[PDB]
Design a protein around this ligand. Structure first.
Ligand SMILES: CC(=O)c1cn(C)c2ccccc12
Length: 117
């Protein structure tokens, strides 16, 4: 029989992994709010990043039952990373900070995924 997830239980299981990302200081700072290309003066951003994602949007989704399965949450976290790694220079602050968050995410998401299945 296939496992089905209750919204508050999926939120409780995944939230610690999101909190771990959000608490990285300074590395979460470029990711705590959506990229605003108008405010940052980068009109080319949405020509490269078709599906923006950031930590505040991931949290708002985890809080409002928008993830039905844990892998939809994992997909959004990787989308945030892959956007940053495509747009930014490899030794830029944003790219280096992204790679730190991805290290933290990998080290934390594995037991949670095993425990959820
Ligand atoms: C997440 C991301 O790509 C970026 C976040 N900030 C604050 C930026 C500033 C310039 C270029 C890219 C970004």
């Amino acid at each position: 029989r296939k496992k089905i997830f209750k919204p508050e239980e999926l939120r409780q299981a995944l939230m610690p992994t999101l909190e771990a990302l959000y608490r990285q200081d300074p590395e979460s700072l470029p990711f705590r709010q959506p990229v605003d290309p108008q405010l940052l003066g980068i009109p080319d951003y949405f020509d490269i990043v078709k599906n923006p994602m950031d930590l505040s949007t991931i949290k708002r989704k985890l809080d409002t039952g928008q993830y039905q399965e844990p892998w939809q949450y994992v997909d959004d976290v990787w989308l945030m990373f892959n956007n940053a790694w495509l747009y930014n220079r490899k030794t830029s602050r944003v790219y280096k900070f992204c790679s730190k968050l991805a290290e933290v995410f990998e080290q934390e998401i594995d037991p949670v995924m095993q425990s959820l299945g």
